[PDB]
Amino acid sequence: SFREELEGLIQEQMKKGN
Amino acid sequence: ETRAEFAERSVAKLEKTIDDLEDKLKCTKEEHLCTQRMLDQTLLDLNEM
Amino acid sequence: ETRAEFAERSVTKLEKSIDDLEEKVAHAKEENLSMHQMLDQTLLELNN
Amino acid sequence: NVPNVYPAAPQGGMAALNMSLGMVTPVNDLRGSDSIAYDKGEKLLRCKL
Amino acid sequence: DDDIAALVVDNGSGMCKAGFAGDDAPRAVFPSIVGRPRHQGVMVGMGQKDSYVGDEAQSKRGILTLKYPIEHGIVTNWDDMEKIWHHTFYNELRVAPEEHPVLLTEAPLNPKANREKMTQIMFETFNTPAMYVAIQAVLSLYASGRTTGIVMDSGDGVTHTVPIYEGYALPHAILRLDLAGRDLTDYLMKILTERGYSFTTTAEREIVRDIKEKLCYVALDFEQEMATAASSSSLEKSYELPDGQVITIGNERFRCPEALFQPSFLGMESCGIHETTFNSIMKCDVDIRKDLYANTVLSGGTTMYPGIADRMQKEITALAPSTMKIKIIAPPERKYSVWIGGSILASLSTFQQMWISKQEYDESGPSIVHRKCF
Amino acid sequence: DDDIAALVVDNGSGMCKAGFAGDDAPRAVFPSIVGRPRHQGVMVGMGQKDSYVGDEAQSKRGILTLKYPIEHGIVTNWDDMEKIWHHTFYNELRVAPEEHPVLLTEAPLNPKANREKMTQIMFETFNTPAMYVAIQAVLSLYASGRTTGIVMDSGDGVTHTVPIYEGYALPHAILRLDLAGRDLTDYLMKILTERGYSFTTTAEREIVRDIKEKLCYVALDFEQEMATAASSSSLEKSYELPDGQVITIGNERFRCPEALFQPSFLGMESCGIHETTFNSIMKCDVDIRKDLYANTVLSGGTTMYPGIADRMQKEITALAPSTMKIKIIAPPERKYSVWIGGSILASLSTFQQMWISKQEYDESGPSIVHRKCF
Amino acid sequence: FSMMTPINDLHTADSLNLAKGERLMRCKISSVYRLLDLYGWAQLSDTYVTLRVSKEQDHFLISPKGVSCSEVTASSLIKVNILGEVVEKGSSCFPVDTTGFCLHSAIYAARPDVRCIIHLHTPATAAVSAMKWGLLPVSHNALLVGDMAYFDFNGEMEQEADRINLQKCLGPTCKILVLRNHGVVALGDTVEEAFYKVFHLQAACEIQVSALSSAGGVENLILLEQEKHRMQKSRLGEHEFEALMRMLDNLGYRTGYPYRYPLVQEKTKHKSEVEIPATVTKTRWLNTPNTYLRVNVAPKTTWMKADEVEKSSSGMPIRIENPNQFVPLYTDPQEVLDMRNKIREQNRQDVKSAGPQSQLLASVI
Numbered sequence A: 001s002f003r004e005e006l007e008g009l010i011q012e013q014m015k016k017g018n
Numbered sequence B: 001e002t003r004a005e006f007a008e009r010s011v012a013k014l015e016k017t018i019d020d021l022e023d024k025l026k027c028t029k030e031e032h033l034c035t036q037r038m039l040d041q042t043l044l045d046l047n048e049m
Numbered sequence C: 001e002t003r004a005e006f007a008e009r010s011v012t013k014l015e016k017s018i019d020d021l022e023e024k025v026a027h028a029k030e031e032n033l034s035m036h037q038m039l040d041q042t043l044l045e046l047n048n
Numbered sequence D: 001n002v003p004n005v006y007p008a009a010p011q012g013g014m015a016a017l018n019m020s021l022g023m024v025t026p027v028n029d030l031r032g033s034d035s036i037a038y039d040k041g042e043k044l045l046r047c048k049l
Numbered sequence E, F: 001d002d003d004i005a006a007l008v009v010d011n012g013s014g015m016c017k018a019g020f021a022g023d024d025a026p027r028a029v030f031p032s033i034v035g036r037p038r039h040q041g042v043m044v045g046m047g048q049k050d051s052y053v054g055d056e057a058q059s060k061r062g063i064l065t066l067k068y069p070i071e072h073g074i075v076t077n078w079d080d081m082e083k084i085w086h087h088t089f090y091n092e093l094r095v096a097p098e099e100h101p102v103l104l105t106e107a108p109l110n111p112k113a114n115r116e117k118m119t120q121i122m123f124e125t126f127n128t129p130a131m132y133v134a135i136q137a138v139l140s141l142y143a144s145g146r147t148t149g150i151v152m153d154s155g156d157g158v159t160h161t162v163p164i165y166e167g168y169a170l171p172h173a174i175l176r177l178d179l180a181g182r183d184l185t186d187y188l189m190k191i192l193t194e195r196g197y198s199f200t201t202t203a204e205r206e207i208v209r210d211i212k213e214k215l216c217y218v219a220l221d222f223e224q225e226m227a228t229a230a231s232s233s234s235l236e237k238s239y240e241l242p243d244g245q246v247i248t249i250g251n252e253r254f255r256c257p258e259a260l261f262q263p264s265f266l267g268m269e270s271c272g273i274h275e276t277t278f279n280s281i282m283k284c285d286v287d288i289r290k291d292l293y294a295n296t297v298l299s300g301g302t303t304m305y306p307g308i309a310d311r312m313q314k315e316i317t318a319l320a321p322s323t324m325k326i327k328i329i330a331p332p333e334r335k336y337s338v339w340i341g342g343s344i345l346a347s348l349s350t351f352q353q354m355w356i357s358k359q360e361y362d363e364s365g366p367s368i369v370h371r372k373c374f
Numbered sequence G: 001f002s003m004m005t006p007i008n009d010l011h012t013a014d015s016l017n018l019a020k021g022e023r024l025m026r027c028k029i030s031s032v033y034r035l036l037d038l039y040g041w042a043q044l045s046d047t048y049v050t051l052r053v054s055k056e057q058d059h060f061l062i063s064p065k066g067v068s069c070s071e072v073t074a075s076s077l078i079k080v081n082i083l084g085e086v087v088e089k090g091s092s093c094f095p096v097d098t099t100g101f102c103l104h105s106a107i108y109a110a111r112p113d114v115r116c117i118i119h120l121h122t123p124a125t126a127a128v129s130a131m132k133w134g135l136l137p138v139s140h141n142a143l144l145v146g147d148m149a150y151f152d153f154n155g156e157m158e159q160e161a162d163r164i165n166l167q168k169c170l171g172p173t174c175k176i177l178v179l180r181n182h183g184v185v186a187l188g189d190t191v192e193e194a195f196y197k198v199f200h201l202q203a204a205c206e207i208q209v210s211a212l213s214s215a216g217g218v219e220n221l222i223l224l225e226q227e228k229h230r231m232q233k234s235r236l237g238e239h240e241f242e243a244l245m246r247m248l249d250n251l252g253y254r255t256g257y258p259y260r261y262p263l264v265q266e267k268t269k270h271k272s273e274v275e276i277p278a279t280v281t282k283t284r285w286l287n288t289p290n291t292y293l294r295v296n297v298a299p300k301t302t303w304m305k306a307d308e309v310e311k312s313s314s315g316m317p318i319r320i321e322n323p324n325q326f327v328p329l330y331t332d333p334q335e336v337l338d339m340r341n342k343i344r345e346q347n348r349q350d351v352k353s354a355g356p357q358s359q360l361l362a363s364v365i
């Protein structure tokens, strides 16, 4: 759960940065 | 070191057992505070009739 | 041997304190038994 | 705490009270430390519902 | 080994740690020091070198001028930095940097150009395929297991407290204080002069740092402990020098770390760490402060003083409102926690998209790191 | 009247001005700071006071901890204000307070207890015969020659916009916003740390404030100006520090005041100053909108940045309705205007009924100021 | 622009004569008036809802004439008798007309078990009452309403014959009365049950009007048959009224309604094994490494080393609470430079001055 939650969170830093 | 290592493993398992008692204490005071306030409100309503 | 002898006595008093702590949490849960029961009794009395 | 309830139409009390409660109470309270506790897929469905 | 695994390198002012991606433990931990000989050398035919690097430099302390390449978290001598990185890649890890990506950590607030330099001498000389730069204190929160909380990291070079909300940091609330373990070592050397013992060279500073690591603790109450030391002599310890002399430091055990909480001893204007993290919390929004009090995480080498957690909790509870609950989080392996966070960040499958490609660097120059790294 | 002139004392959050009524220029303008020594004084016969007030304190910046008695437009140290008033009356002007009336200025929206405390302090200790309290933003319009218009004021404490309609301050439409010069100075530190220049003590805050005063301007278009600054180095200028070092400010010159228009840089969720003025006019009735758009006066210390006038005009044109009369009236002396308005108001013959006698205060306590002065 | 007023208002009044159950009843009736206004069913001044406080003392509570339903507070209502005389003057200073209370008083004279009487003048209810045939069981709400009675209303109940004609037509046990061309009246033992019946009848009447207008006639309605349909414990309308009081309290309204089942709000927390436990349980100081002990003369004072073998104290602290304590506060800077000049220029002028001499030499001279 925690591992794939950070998976998703890093996904939105990609979405959010550019 | 041989009769060290077993002690550290068993005692680490012991803190991880401690923490459940600790946070269930945490829940227990807080629901005392809520139920004691609630009973005080009910007693106030009883006094006001 | 110094590291071993320190760690064992340290969590020995930890285990002693936790056996002490279990009685306290049992007291608190038994207290909630009276809290729930006595509050239910008050609301039943007010429901009359 | 002066919630500042919106004025209503003569036939529009429901809408005004609904938007006042929407201003007061957010529908997504899971944000913060509580967001970890629920599943990622389940939390989004809860928000949608 | 079958697939290329990234290299996680944590590089602070005090020591350098290096390991492989996804590993539990770093492979190499060694002081970040570059030494050069000072005395005349007349022994022809045996081992002499113009410069010593790493743990070998600290082995032969008696014939060197130890020189730290990183000062206050800022790299001031880049040739020694390249020598440290070369000794890290080849002598310790013994793996070529061109096969594997590398991950570096860096301070939150810093000069801009430093990052550019960390780019330029990493692609051009070591010929790495890709790298990434991450803030040091975020990895502590990742390794602790929490996505929301405020973290203090006080290394050997700089102290900084950052609050992170929903795993995504707040830049405006970042507080940075230039008070760390090296200034504590200098203060301890200054106050050890009053008893008669004198320490002046670089090897003596290393010895004083060892004394600080061995016998120091933070008092729960300064006035009560000072009066206790005024009463009896139970607060005395004896340390044996490498010369063979024995010194009794006594009262100074809790005066050296007390400069962390009262920086007026050093003459600095800024106040202690506890009100610093209190102001960092107060700079955030009101709604998120409840999670910030319950998720305070300590990290860094300086935060391994005995009794630091109780004193910190008492001070921050004195500052906090009475209705709020305070929870301090002190990992038993906090000293390495940043590196552990790096090992988490190099194992995520989404992180493969984060890497700065060599072709991208060749297209965009050294300024790619500001837009690519957050 | 003829024999004695009323004392006009403007208590700004950063500076304090004082003079005689009916005069063009204030006699003494000095910073509103109070410093205490921070180091042990060993010279026996040179003479060291317990605390330094005003310009004497700012001369010896290196050995003092400067404290501001007024914080965000709210007094936080009343005996410190007693010190600053004692310094104003006795040292700067060398006139007794018991022989002349005094005039005091205040923020448009302040707590009642603040007014009561000012009245109690001014009557109980200084024993002044007559005093009066005026709104700071109202007197600027009197100095403007106007009786109807919107007044925007921005000092070191707080920035507020009020409408005035034939001398009436509408209480509902007065708007407040926490974008002062001190926050711009703090943001100037926060952006100066990028280049590599570190300022941390309260002594260097005056240096950063002087840098802000001397080398800043407001961009007409931010997006074009960032590309212009990235393209060429013609925007860079050099400043010469008190210790002899030379810094190059470069890009940040139009980044310091931009926090006024976009408060999201500082982390505040509030709207910009242009939106604040627009909403302030929006809250009034329709009939006076035409003479509020056709009549706008800028005042305060912050409003002397070069190029703020055209940017303000463009940003308020972008929000105004079509074919609307828009004009900004900024006097060159816009941050001495409050004292000018105070002296003008004290100069009139029909103003002499505003004075509160000592007998009136003695009869009705400190609460008479609110009934006498509405 | 903050039109809301506190419904309770018992705090502000501090007057008059009230029974033990008067506070709850007044809060209930004022909350009912607020809910009738806030649904939009009624908006102007009339006497819609009436309550009985005591079964053996009458003293019914009615609304004063000329007050809108939004402006109704608990203290502003008027307590009267069965006949209609103002036995208790309300807090509101308005002229009192007690004409429309008479119909409610006739219904009160009919049934002893009724305590809440609600009258409706909504357009859909009046359209249903004006209709020749009775209300049709064409909706689930109408089925849940139950039985009903129909009585022709001439608009005045002052005559004794009309009052005695209402009593048998109403029935011994009936909850819903329909006044033709005038609307509906609901009778409830409790306020919540009457409110529930009012809401269900209200929904059912727009259902019936819309379906009857769109369908045309009765044949297309395919109406159902009512006969074929046939803590402690809840009493019909407890839960809905409790929820309404809860949400109204969350608006900031002060309602005196106490809750039979109170509400508990807990966030709770899910324990995660990845999370590490919490695991918790001015002045400058000058140090002296030694301690001196006073020893008598062996008079002249003597101080003693007291070395560490004799278990002496380790660290002696000296505290400085303010800067510049070494220098006196009040000092002229010119004096030191003046004395420096005075001392120095005696070198320039090269004096013949000798040091002081002791007085033992002066005595022998």
Ligand SMILES: Nc1ncnc2c1ncn2[C@@H]1O[C@H](COP(=O)(O)OP(=O)(O)O)[C@@H](O)[C@H]1O
Pocket (backbone or CB within 6 Å): E011, E012, E013, E014, E015, E016, E154, E155, E156, E157, E181, E182, E209, E212, E213, E214, E300, E301, E302, E304, E305, E335
């Ligand atoms: N066990 C300890 N007790 C007290 N101080 C310590 C301890 N370990 C390390 N330190 C201090 O912390 C410093 C190391 O900090 P570290 O976290 O390694 O810095 P970084 O990792 O940021 O380079 C050392 O210089 C030492 O002064």
Ligand SMILES: Nc1ncnc2c1ncn2[C@@H]1O[C@H](COP(=O)(O)OP(=O)(O)O)[C@@H](O)[C@H]1O
Pocket (backbone or CB within 6 Å): F011, F012, F013, F014, F015, F154, F155, F156, F157, F181, F182, F209, F212, F213, F214, F300, F301, F302, F304, F305, F335
């Ligand atoms: N010539 C100038 N150029 C730029 N900024 C200035 C200038 N003079 C004053 N300021 C700014 O104005 C502020 C002083 O405002 P001030 O007028 O004292 O406020 P108040 O209205 O409270 O008296 C200072 O912080 C300074 O940054």
